Design a protein around this ligand. Structure first.
Ligand SMILES: CC(=O)N[C@@H]1[C@@H](O)[C@@H](F)[C@@](OP(=O)(O)OC[C@H]2O[C@@H](n3ccc(N)nc3=O)[C@H](O)[C@@H]2O)(C(=O)O)O[C@H]1[C@H](O)[C@H](O)CO
Length: 377
């Protein structure tokens, strides 16, 4: 065959993993690769080092038909090594399956590697708590078969459908939380079904790269020396982490921005409900897609050092530049943050809260929603 590797992801977590996979295999300069990473730009100085390297836009959680043009350049029998976001796996693979249909004599799927979008997969699984999980799995397998045979998507349980790819292809799942699958009793039928097809995201992978590869990885994720320097100060550090909303509604976006600024004040102001104390150097790590919500913090706060929103929080853990304390709105970065670094996690019963409780990320005490916090000032 000829193997072609596809790295597809509209979010941040799967892309971090996929770029790690690329880095680990970066000695091979001619392996055909197609990158469809919405939040990551491979620098030109890296691109020129590679041959058979291609890029595809994602739209509506699927690579566009520009994908076909790329694949058409590889005439022989081709095997696809596909890396995907778990939550959006069905849509992301849709055009690839469409191409295989057209070239069924030549194109085959070699294997799938799936990575969590983030907290969405867990919140969605939490909503399945009262279902006959075994029956859901069996029905999802049947509907996946229909999808593979007809090219048409219709799943009664879109959540469980994310976990039945093994009924069709060799697959490996990479979870942000393996504990969830092992601690949530209602998921026992799914944990058993998945058998030996999953593992945890390996956050120590960066430490196993050579120093030259580590530097390569950092350029792929946007972690420059200026940011590193800003984090190397001797003073104790607190990073306030931002969130976002997908709502376009101006009122909702402004509400999020206002509530988030108020939350920051509760951490940093002496009269705040979450006051961290004096002597912490304050940083802001905005959400990669926070937009004007991020700007609102920088425009209205004081004595805060920005960490470019496009830099994923987990990169700090890789480089050993984690701060003393971290607080802000619940987000996927808290799933991998060392427990000793948590100041307070705030939420905007609630399935996200339940997930965090099951995992011990938060304790038994009443959670704090940001609308329960007095408007300081
Ligand atoms: C329930 C739900 O919808 N969860 C999704 C989740 O599956 C994933 F789609 C995402 O992930 P989410 O928890 O926000 O953020 C996951 C990442 O983005 C980076 N990050 C985040 C925040 C921050 N201040 N600095 C960072 O660097 C970190 O790498 C982390 O792991 C996402 O957009 O990728 O956003 C959420 C939320 O829809 C959104 O948070 C609430 O509207």
């Amino acid at each position: 065959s000829k193997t072609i590797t596809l790295y597809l992801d509209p979010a941040s977590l799967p892309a971090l993993n996929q770029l790690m996979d690329f880095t680990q295999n970066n000695e091979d300069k001619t392996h055909p690769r197609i990158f469809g990473l919405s939040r990551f730009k491979i620098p030109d100085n890296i691109i020129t080092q590679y041959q058979n390297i291609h890029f595809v836009e994602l739209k509506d959680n699927r690579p566009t038909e520009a994908l076909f043009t790329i694949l058409d350049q590889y005439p022989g029998n081709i095997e696809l090594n596909i890396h995907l976001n778990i939550a959006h796996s069905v849509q992301l693979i849709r055009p690839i399956l469409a191409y295989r249909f057209k070239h069924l004599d030549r194109v085959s799927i070699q294997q799938l590697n799936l990575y969590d979008d983030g907290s969405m997969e867990y919140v969605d699984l939490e909503k399945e708590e009262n279902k006959d999980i075994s029956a859901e799995i069996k029905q999802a397998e049947k509907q996946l078969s229909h999808y593979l045979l007809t090219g048409k998507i219709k799943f009664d349980n879109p959540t469980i459908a994310r976990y039945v790819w093994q009924s069709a292809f060799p697959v490996k799942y990479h979870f942000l939380s393996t504990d969830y699958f092992e601690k949530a009793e209602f998921l026992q039928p799914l944990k058993e079904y998945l058998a030996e097809n999953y593992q945890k995201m390996d956050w120590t992978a960066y430490q196993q790269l050579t120093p030259e590869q580590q530097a390569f990885y950092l350029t792929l994720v946007g972690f420059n020396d200026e940011v590193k320097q800003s984090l190397e100060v001797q003073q104790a550090k607190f990073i306030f982490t931002g969130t976002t909303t997908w709502e376009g509604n101006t009122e909702v976006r402004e509400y999020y921005a206002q509530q988030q600024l108020n939350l920051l004040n509760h951490f940093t102001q002496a009269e705040g409900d979450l006051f961290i104390g004096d002597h912490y150097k304050i940083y802001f790590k905005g959400h990669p897609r926070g937009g004007e919500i991020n700007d609102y913090i920088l425009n209205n706060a004081k004595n805060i050092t920005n960490i470019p929103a496009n830099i994923s929080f987990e990169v700090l853990m890789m480089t050993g530049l984690l701060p003393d304390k971290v607080g802000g709105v619940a987000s996927s970065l808290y799933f991998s943050l060392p427990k000793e670094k948590i100041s307070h996690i705030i939420f905007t019963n609630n399935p996200y809260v339940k997930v965090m409780r099951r995992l011990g990320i938060i304790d038994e005490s009443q959670v704090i929603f940001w609308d329960s916090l007095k408007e300081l000032g």
